[PDB]
Design a protein around this ligand. Structure first.
Ligand SMILES: O[C@@H](CNc1cc(-c2ccc3c(c2)OCCO3)ncn1)c1ccccc1
Length: 543
């Protein structure tokens, strides 16, 4: 009965969305009258490096590449529901774009949390509706300064604490390969859009896998750098001052070269001048372009989330293809993964028991795809500890998350923050002892059914670990689900048998033809190495 403002918020958001799309369309069709004989699917097809080349040499005009992609985005949006807003003024930015910039005339999609002047960054929440950004976030300024034309705000799951992608304002985003499936999240609108040719390049945030999931589920590249490689200034979030598990932002694109282009474009003196709290580490092209044989750690499971057959096959086929290229593959597994997930990561994100998070939800509709998170955090802490002590014998994995989602005293979070530092060094010591360069990893895939990710929390294990360690981690699509793999899904039993295993069992069925990826990891500040290795995987696993 107190959803007055929630119902009103949503109505405004949908008309703002509808007006954006209607504006986008009447823009595109104006253009197509004056540009009929023009090779739009050669343009949309063109890889980004190609595209910048023609924009810089002046073979294609910026308006052509803008209004061609603008049309395509609008078309793919009809199946997917992945464009929140059309960024108003981008037509004006196109004409006054910095001409010798590294992304001159490249149109760029932005996850909604990236502040853009005059536009809401709602995060699917009614409390953030009707509250336009006073100015562009630091990375958007650098984008615009480097010649790019940010043009849409792509959708996110309510609060971004979910690897599905629905909210009560703009509704549910769907996977462009199969509309019964989730596109991933929280950068789901990004993946859906880029993954269907709606944008050559875009920007996401990751805190539990939120770049890597949608990249994998929608079959594109994506990199989560080290937390403070790039400027978090101006990004809209649920919680501020949680530093233990640090959020990280990075690129999402159709290929690995695009990603390396994009970092090289942002890591410049503009970024470091505009935000001196970021360490002025220039993009080292020498390391990215190296062809030195790699010592590559690997594991085909984390013993926590049982991989799908597709994942397992993707991991082994890459492992072996890499061996044939001459890289040295070494079995490697970080110590105490259950501890990192159940105690450290979970404790880090909900150190305060959720009370900060939850005030975003007061008087709002709770999206079904958040599952039982809001209800669980809303429970009082004595009931969490009691209920944990009952479940532990029967369901340790679930009892352990519950035990570490209670509020704690400043003394206890100092102790947790120390264990994270020590754990990070603990895994670095494993790494250095086996002299590895990079680390090959499975990656959750194929894409889950809709409203499944919310009730399959174990499956964050593959990605979350490296938010916890704060290692640069990216994904590359390597293969597509065979019927042989989809059939092998009915022998899937999981390592625990609790409901997260059961939900994801069914969630991952009926996924023939969907893409499946692997994860690449490096030590901190070695983003350029992570991309060298991702690029290697990309070359060796193309069909
Ligand atoms: O389902 C859970 C409650 N939900 C969560 C969710 C997440 C979570 C954290 C980071 C994420 C994310 C999800 O989504 C992707 C991006 O980042 N972490 C811990 N708990 C549960 C617990 C006890 C009993 C029953 C059910």
């Amino acid at each position: 009965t107190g959803r007055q403002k929630a119902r009103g918020a949503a109505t405004r958001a949908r008309q703002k969305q509808r007006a954006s799309l209607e504006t986008m369309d009447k823009a595109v069709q104006r253009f197509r009258l004056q540009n009929p004989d023009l090779d739009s699917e050669a343009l949309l097809t063109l890889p980004l490096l190609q595209l910048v080349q023609k924009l810089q040499s002046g073979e294609l005009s910026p308006e052509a590449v803008f209004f061609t992609y603008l049309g395509k985005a609008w078309e793919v949006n009809k199946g997917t529901n992945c464009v929140t807003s059309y960024l108003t003024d981008c037509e004006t930015q196109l004409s006054q774009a910095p001409r010798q910039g590294l992304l001159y005339g490249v149109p760029v999609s932005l996850k909604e949390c990236f502040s853009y002047k005059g536009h809401d960054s709602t995060l699917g929440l009614s409390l953030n509706e009707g509250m336009p950004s006073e100015s562009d976030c630091v990375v958007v300024q650098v984008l615009k300064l480097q010649g790019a034309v940010p043009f849409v705000h792509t959708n996110v799951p309510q609060s971004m604490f979910s690897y599905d992608c629905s909210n009560p304002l703009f509704g549910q985003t769907m996977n462009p390969w199969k509309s019964s499936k989730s596109p991933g999240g929280s950068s789901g609108g990004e993946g859906a859009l880029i993954g269907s040719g709606g944008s050559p390049l875009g920007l996401g945030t990751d805190i539990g896998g939120s770049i890597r999931f949608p990249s994998a589920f929608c079959g594109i590249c994506g990199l989560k750098p080290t937390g403070n490689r790039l400027s978090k200034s101006g990004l809209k979030g649920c919680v501020y001052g949680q530093t233990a598990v640090q959020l990280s932002l990075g690129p999402m694109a159709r290929d690995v070269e695009s990603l390396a282009l994009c970092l090289k474009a942002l890591l410049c003196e503009h970024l470091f001048t505009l935000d001196p709290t970021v360490p002025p580490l220039p993009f080292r092209e020498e390391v990215y372009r190296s062809s030195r044989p790699l010592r590559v750690g690997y594991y085909e499971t984390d013993n926590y989330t049982m991989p799908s057959p597709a994942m397992r096959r993707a991991l082994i086929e890459t492992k072996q293809r890499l061996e044939a290229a001459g890289h040295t593959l070494i079995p490697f597994l970080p110590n105490n993964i259950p501890y990192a997930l159940e105690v450290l990561s979970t404790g880090g994100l909900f150190s305060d028991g959720g009370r900060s998070f939850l005030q975003n939800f007061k008087g709002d509709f709770v999206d079904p795809c958040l599952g039982d998170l809001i209800l669980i955090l809303r429970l009082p802490s004595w009931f969490k500890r009691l209920l944990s002590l009952l479940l532990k014998p029967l369901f340790p994995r679930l009892a352990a998350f519950l035990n570490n989602m209670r509020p704690r005293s400043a003394e206890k979070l100092w102790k947790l923050q120390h264990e994270i530092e020590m754990y990070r060094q603990s895994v670095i010591a494993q790494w250095k002892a086996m002299n590895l360069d990079v680390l090959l990893t499975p990656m959750l895939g194929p894409a889950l059914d809709l409203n499944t990710p919310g009730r399959a929390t174990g499956a964050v294990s593959y990605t979350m670990l490296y938010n916890c360690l704060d290692f640069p981690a990216g994904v590359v699509p390597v293969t597509t689900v065979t019927a042989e793999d989809d059939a092998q899904m009915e022998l899937y039993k999981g390592y625990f048998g609790d409901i997260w295993d059961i939900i994801l069992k069914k969630a991952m069925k009926n996924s023939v033809g969907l893409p499946v990826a692997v994860q690449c990891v490096a030590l901190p500040w070695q983003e350029e190495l992570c991309l060298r290795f991702m690029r290697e995987v990309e070359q060796l696993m193309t069909p």
